[PDB]
Amino acid sequence: APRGNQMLGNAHFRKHWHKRIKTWFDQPARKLRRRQNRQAKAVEIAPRPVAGLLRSVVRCPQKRYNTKTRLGRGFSLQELKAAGISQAQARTIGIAVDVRRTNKTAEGLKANADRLKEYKAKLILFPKKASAPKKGDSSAEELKVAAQLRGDVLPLSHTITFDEPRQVTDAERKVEIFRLLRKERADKKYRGKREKRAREAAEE
Amino acid sequence: HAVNTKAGKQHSAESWGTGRAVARIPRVRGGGTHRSGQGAFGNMCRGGHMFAPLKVFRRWHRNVNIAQKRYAVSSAIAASGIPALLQARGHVIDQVAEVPLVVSDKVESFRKTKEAVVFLRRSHLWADIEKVYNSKRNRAGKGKLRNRQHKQKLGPVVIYGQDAECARAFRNIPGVDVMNVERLNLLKLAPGGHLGRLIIWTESAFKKLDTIYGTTVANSSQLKKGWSVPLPIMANSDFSRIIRSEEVVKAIRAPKKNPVLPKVHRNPLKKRTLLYKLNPYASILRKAS
Amino acid sequence: MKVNPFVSSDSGKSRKAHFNAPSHERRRIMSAPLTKELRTKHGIRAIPIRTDDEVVVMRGRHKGNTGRVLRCYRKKFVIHIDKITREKANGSTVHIGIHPSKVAITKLKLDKDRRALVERKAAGRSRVTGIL
RNA sequence: UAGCUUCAGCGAUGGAUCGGUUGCAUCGAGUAUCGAUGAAGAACGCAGCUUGCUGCGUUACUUACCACGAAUUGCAGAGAGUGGUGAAAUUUCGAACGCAUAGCACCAACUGGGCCUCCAGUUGGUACGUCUGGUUCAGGGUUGUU
RNA sequence: CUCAACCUGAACUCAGUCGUGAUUACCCGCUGAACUUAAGCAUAUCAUUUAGCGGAGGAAAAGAAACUAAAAAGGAUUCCCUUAGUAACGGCGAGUGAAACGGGAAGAGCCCAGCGCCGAAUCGAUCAGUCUUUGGCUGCUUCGAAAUGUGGCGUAUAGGUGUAAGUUUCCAGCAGUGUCGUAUGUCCGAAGUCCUUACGAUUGAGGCCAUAAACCAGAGAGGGUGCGAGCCCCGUUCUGGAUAGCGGCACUGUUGGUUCGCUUGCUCCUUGGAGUCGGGUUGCUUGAAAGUGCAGCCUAAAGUGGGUGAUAAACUUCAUCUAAGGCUAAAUAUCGACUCGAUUGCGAUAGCGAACAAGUACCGUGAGGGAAAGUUGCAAAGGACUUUGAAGAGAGAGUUCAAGAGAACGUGAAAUCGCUGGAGUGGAACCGGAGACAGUUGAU
RNA sequence: ACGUUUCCGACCCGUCUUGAAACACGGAUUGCGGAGUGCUUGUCUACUGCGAGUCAAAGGGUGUUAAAACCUUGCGGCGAA
RNA sequence: CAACGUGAAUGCGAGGUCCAAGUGGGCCAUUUUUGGUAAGCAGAACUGGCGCUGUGGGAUGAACCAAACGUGGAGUUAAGGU
RNA sequence: GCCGUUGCGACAAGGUCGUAACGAGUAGGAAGGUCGUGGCGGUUGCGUUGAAGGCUGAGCGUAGGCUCGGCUGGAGCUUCCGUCAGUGCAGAUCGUAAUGGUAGUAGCAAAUAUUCAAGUUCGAUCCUUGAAGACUGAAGUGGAGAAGGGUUCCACGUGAACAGUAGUUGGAUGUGGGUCAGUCGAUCCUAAGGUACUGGCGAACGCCUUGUAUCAUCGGUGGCG
RNA sequence: UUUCUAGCGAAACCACAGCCAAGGGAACGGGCUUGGCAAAAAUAGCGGGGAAAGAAGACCCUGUUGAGCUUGACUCUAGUUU
């Protein structure tokens, strides 16, 4: 029996909720277990990076996020070709391949091609047989500085830069921004009606 | 902690209803044993469920604002530098050289409890540990049965900046704690929520305090982003000097006493001097009479 | 303070282990210290007591009495020493049980295995005392 | 006086309270291991004296082997006895298997009855479904051949 | 009609296999309520949930887009935070109620059918050799499976042919050499039972050269010992040692098998799942709203076809995947089982029903129901002996710090009850106020 | 002062009820147990920190008196239309 | 903007916001009053009470008359009495 | 005169003091509680020269309650500061355990019935012997079995409990002993009926039919061997 | 049988308790007010009272409480016909 000015109740507790209860008392235990798993994996695959495969750069899908980039699943075959890396070779040297993604824009393709290039620059390849090196394998003293990498491979930078102050140009001021926006909206909204009118005029 | 969710509800118990001359509590079913026909379930019954059985999903842990945690740690550190507060908290600092007590980095090289004890004795800090020894005692209550057998006083805390594994020399001394200046624990700086823990700073730890906790300038702390020492609400914190200051004394007016009232009403119609004081002409009238 | 995460500081667990220890563990539990002279002579501090050892009572109402260990009643966690007896009502004599931790060994009943054990303990004591 | 009520002292009846605690509750961690090679469970039995509980299975409160190294204990009694446990062994019911479900019956071998077609004993074997292959088959179902 | 094939179907105590039945915490597939809320009640809610049935594992299931979406796009599955009590559903009432984008944990990819090429190049038993034999390797062993097609290449990222460049091994065991973990056994460890005192018994109190001092302390966790103990014992600390066993690695050798391949350019060729999809209707289900998912019946495809783009339909712009076949670790769930560590929990009417011969005694024909019950003392030293009695038992005595701790034994409350002394006592007794008496208590 | 004796006063408590000493109900006596809780979501109030900001989640890094504490957010919640 | 200056009695400090409990069976009396033959009956109006409240008096009594309450004392009284 | 509340005021104080007025209260609301209880983080101390608990004299407080003394007891307890709560009982025909008056009371009265002498025993209405007197009265108060019981059977001891008096006795209690089959039964046959196979159904555990539903269900003489 | 004796030995019930008249009161008091009165401890009977005990009235009403049954109630359904 609510009395007076109250917000109407909404609590979803009319089911037998006592049969489905989940607590979080094992949160620090899970943290410790995951740290130990990472340590074991690092020991297992040393000196390879603990994170694993190298991931690609990606624009966030929708216009709410399209000004931000993030790590993708892998590198498209177009990017691998642009960087001159075979898919088979990439799987061996630890680069993620996204067989579903395709590039439709030069800028997006180029960003990932450059990422692959810098990864190859930073790569250290051990000889397949320690006794006998080959072509492509890293040099002896290079193989001494090898160290296991922790965290993301080639982590992304999220710092925001500010455009340098400049002069306000006259042509910039003479533009009618609101009129332009409303004109674009109107043109899109009435595009079809004008086409219908044009077709009728042609038929007459 | 919680009780079993089925505790006290493991009986096929039904009420007898009215007409049997007994209370309508649910009663254990069957026969051939004492339990049969006895009350069940209710919190008033022997062997039933408690009232509102305590659940395991109670709010045990809390969210504490980071800003307020930092304020509390800074306040505890500041209070550790006041001799009076340590005495009020019970530490024996009668012959301690100086508060705060900063010692050479050589203490960070200590590796044997013998060396640590010698240093504490020569620093006139052994009185505190002696009191810690005297304070060991049996905990009163059920705690004894739950792996909390003894209660004893807390000693000083040694804070270091660069550990040459120095905490080993100090672990075994009762009451003495050891901390790293980078990760300072409020639970050890202000035990029981009380201010004035006795601290032994090493030189490196003392030097790192400005870096870790900043200054009164905004964002002066380098290891805590955006943190700086809180500013006081009162500049001069002593209430007597402000009152006795010349500026305040000039504005203050002269102290006064409680106003005085007659209190007792007498009977001038029955007394002489009272009436003659209130109305001097009455004496002349009586003289005329 | 203990550091081993697999060692329990639970009073209940400790008491349960002590009072349910099997015979070979009760042997180790029922250990007695050596006298000063025996300690300097053999190099060890304490040893699991054994029948036919000579002991001296160090505490209790029988402090100072000596004799030989007649039995090691591991079930009752006591030893029966020679000459340490009382008289029942009827007149029979019963040995008074003493806890081995309250006596000191004055002569070790040595055999092949006891000699090997003492050698091991002395070697370990020397090894650790050198490092300390 | 007696009885009754009440007070002080003493004593019964009763088992509250207090003092711990090898028990319980909850939280967390590590592992993946039942069964036709007969499981889970049940029944009966096993000890010098031992009903119950615990343990065990006809080698029956346990054998062998390995570690440690002198006991067990209520009374007796005479590498002990504990722990680990890789060898051996593991009764009858039970999916439960010859059929039935608290009973009775079939096949072989061997042994004894003197011989044995007849008895008795011992040992191996006889369940349902299903896969692969083997053997022996049936049907103008299709086909060839004489 | 004879013989011989195949096809189909049998019988075998034929040779050799496999399934059944348990467990419940989590997992997968079904079946499926009502109490209750709506202040009545029928849709709704409880709830796609108790209950019932089936089937696995250490995890299971899912899983490599017939996806999200509409950016300058993301890119298997699982899980967390957020989206969000939002869009939506609902006698539009009570109520119910997601997902993508975003930040993270973990991250791993692949195999068929079909088309095409080689075309039996493939495989099971059995026999004989041989080895490191609870299984493997060799065959003119002999049988059989397989052309109604086993194997090799190959699957949407495609693939293949030829060609030019580059580039080219990989598996499995055995022995050693070291390097490293073990909830794996066994063995090993620093310092007072020092003086005085207290006690029934100390671990309690005081003292132990020294300015800083009994001694050890990387050990002052815990337990035992006549309550109290770092120093009496087991233990504890030595990011402990020694030893045997198990593992994981790395390198050497060796054994057996295996490798005409792989990438990029050009060249020419090539490229896919049917009673399924879709549609109608019926029923259930969902937040899914002219149908989200599932199923019955009828209908029933196509091949740049098919699906989808959340308001149904034509006609149009496009965008995005490729259904009707299959495998796959991690992050995740779970103490039911085995083994461990803890606690602001309970302290014997509490905490599990069960601290104990507890799922026991006992009850019901059965399904099933189901208790009460902890404590002598440091040590039985558990009361010898005398005496009355048939005996229970009592009177002495003895043990003991103590027995008024005497076996149903720590403490031993209230109610109730008996005795001794005092005082009252006419159909209640208790009670408040005010004295008196008795009594108690204080007086430099 | 829970003893006796006098003088005055003095009906049995809890409860529902307009109204209970009631010929209204519960109560023979004593011990022990016994009932406004937990959590989710609101709202107001009080206190604390910061303030156009504030709190940061999952997570990560470190911590062996290591379930704590400490550090860490182009992004998220609420607020700023 | 300029000037004028508080214009009956008596008493007395005034105003604002927020959060929330219990209640939503009443009953009695003087006077007025409807139904009823009446009722310690049923239903209304104003006010005061009882409920929630003891105290002196009416022998006794929820409401009648007097008077309302910390805990004590002295004096004087109300209604009522000698 | 004293206590408190309210308003106002003085004072270098979360305090003290002064002053004037005031003090009813159910349901209900607030405030204070060095009122009381159990934990935790800290702090203050006491303890086998006697803690908790229990019984009860001198006091303190308006009260909740508290302090001390005496006796019992034998191992823990406690001040203050924060914070937390399974935090206070007279009731609920409350749960559980124990105990009263009733009260030495209701009552131990169906089935005809016992008496004498002796034995044993510490002890005899009740056990045993003998004599007498009665009863069931052969559709028995006799002699044996089926179901059911499960050692109750028999002998020797017996103190307590049980045998609603008693007990030397017992279906009680302690210790031992006792059940012998070719012919008596079971075993064997089938009845009413049950339950399998296949066969159908069923999401499934599994059900339905015992029937030409299903159906390739064998076994007998003889020769040969 | 009861009765008395020896042995044995419960239960129901119980706020506290038990002499009346009238009064007023919740309109039929053991208790309150005013009167009548008021002397131990007990045995056997008795059925006036304790509005005596047994049982949260099976009558009546209320409840947005049911169940058995009926049908021309509302909404469905096995089955069956087409």
One-character DSSP codes across A147-186: ----SSSSPPP-----PPP----HHHHT--HHHHHHHHHH
User: Which chain B residue's Cα is nearest to C8?
Assistant: B147
Q: Residues by CB within 7 Å of nucleic chain G, which ones?
A: A 3-6
The answer to whether the beta carbons of residues B203 and B103 sit under 8 Å apart is yes
Neighbours of chain B (3+ CB pairs under 8 A): A, C
Question: Which of chain I's bases lie under 7 Å from a protein CB?
Answer: 13, 54-57
Please give the span between the terminal C-alpha atoms of chain C, in angstroms, as a whole number: 19
Say if B20 is an interface residue toward chain C (CB within 8 Å): no
Separation of alpha carbons A83 and A117, rounded Å: 6
The answer to whether the beta carbons of residues B41 and B49 sit under 8 Å apart is yes
Separation of alpha carbons A83 and A123, rounded Å: 14
3-state helix, strand, coil in chain B (%, to 5): 35, 10, 55
Kindly report the nearest CA distance between residue A20 and chain B, in angstroms: 12
Which residues partner with A100 through β-bridges? none
User: Is B171 close to C1, i.e. CB distance below 8 A?
Assistant: yes
Query: Exposed e or buried b for every residue in C72-109, given b needs 16+ CB within 10 A?
Result: bebeebbbbbeebeeeeeeeeeebeebebbbbbbbebe
- What are the phi and psi torsion angles at A180 (to 5°)? -60, -45
User: Is A23 close to B5, i.e. CB distance below 8 A?
Assistant: no
Given B145, B147, B171, which is nearest C9 (Cβ)?
A: B147
User: Is B147 close to C11, i.e. CB distance below 8 A?
Assistant: yes
Distance C12 CA to E4 C1' (A): 89
Separation of alpha carbons B145 and B139, rounded Å: 10
Separation of alpha carbons A174 and B215, rounded Å: 51
DSSP state of C67: E
H helical segments located in chain C:
11-19, 23-29, 36-42, 112-131
Kindly report the nearest CA distance between residue B140 and chain A, in angstroms: 30
Chain B residues whose CB is inside 8 A of the C9 CB are 147
The answer to whether the beta carbons of residues B93 and B131 sit under 8 Å apart is no
Residue type, A78: Q
Which residues partner with C94 through β-bridges? C86
Q: Is B83 in a helix, a strand, or coil?
A: helix
Chain B residues whose CB is inside 8 A of the A18 CB are 5
Q: Is C46 in a helix, a strand, or coil?
A: strand
* Cβ neighbourhood burial of B28 (10 Å; 0-12, 13-18, 19+): buried
Q: Taking phi first (over 0 means left), then psi (-120 to 50 degrees means alpha), and beta for anything else, what does residue A151 get?
A: left
Separation of alpha carbons A163 and C61, rounded Å: 95
User: What nucleotide is nearest A33 when CA is compared to C1'?
Assistant: D29
Asked whether strand D has any atom less than 7 Å from the CB of C37, the reply is no
Nearest alpha-carbon partner for B199 in B285, B110, B77: B77
Separation of alpha carbons B285 and A121, rounded Å: 130
DSSP state of C109: -
DSSP state of B135: H
User: What nucleotide is nearest B20 when CA is compared to C1'?
Assistant: I55
Asked whether strand I has any atom less than 7 Å from the CB of B19, the reply is yes
Separation of alpha carbons B96 and B91, rounded Å: 11
User: Which chain C residue's Cα is nearest to B174?
Assistant: C1
Chain A residues whose CB is inside 8 A of the B4 CB are none
Separation of alpha carbons C28 and C8, rounded Å: 19
Nearest alpha-carbon partner for A85 in A112, A57, A58: A112
What is the distance of C-alpha A87 from the center of its chain?
20
DSSP state letters, A111-145: HHHHHHHHHHHH-----SBTTB--SSSPPTTTTTS
Separation of alpha carbons C96 and B277, rounded Å: 106
Please give the span between the terminal C-alpha atoms of chain A, in angstroms, as a whole number: 72
- Mutual angle of helices B203-213 and B66-80, in 10-degree steps: 140
Q: Say what the alpha-carbon torsion angle A63, A65, A68, A73 is, to the nearest 10 degrees.
A: -100
DSSP state letters, A38-55: HHHHHHHHTTS-SS-SBP
The answer to whether the beta carbons of residues B187 and B229 sit under 8 Å apart is no
The answer to whether the beta carbons of residues A115 and A57 sit under 8 Å apart is yes
Chain C residues whose CB is inside 8 A of the B142 CB are none
Separation of alpha carbons B109 and A14, rounded Å: 64
Torsion B91-B95-B101-B104 (CA) sign: negative
In the 97-136 segment of chain A, residues within 7 Å (Cβ) of strand E are: 97-105, 107-108, 128, 130-131, 134-135
Say if A12 is an interface residue toward chain B (CB within 8 Å): no
Between residues 10 and 29 of chain C, which touch chain B (CB distance below 8 Å)?
10-11
3-state helix, strand, coil in chain A (%, to 5): 40, 5, 55
Method: cryo-EM
Residues in chain C that come right before a backbone break, where C and next N are over 2.5 Å apart:
none
Nearest alpha-carbon partner for A154 in A87, A81, A69, A27: A69
Separation of alpha carbons B205 and B158, rounded Å: 10
Residue type, B192: G
The answer to whether the beta carbons of residues A124 and A136 sit under 8 Å apart is no
User: Is B5 close to A21, i.e. CB distance below 8 A?
Assistant: no
User: What nucleotide is nearest B62 when CA is compared to C1'?
Assistant: F68
Query: Exposed e or buried b for every residue in A181-191, given b needs 16+ CB within 10 A?
Result: eeeeeeeeeee
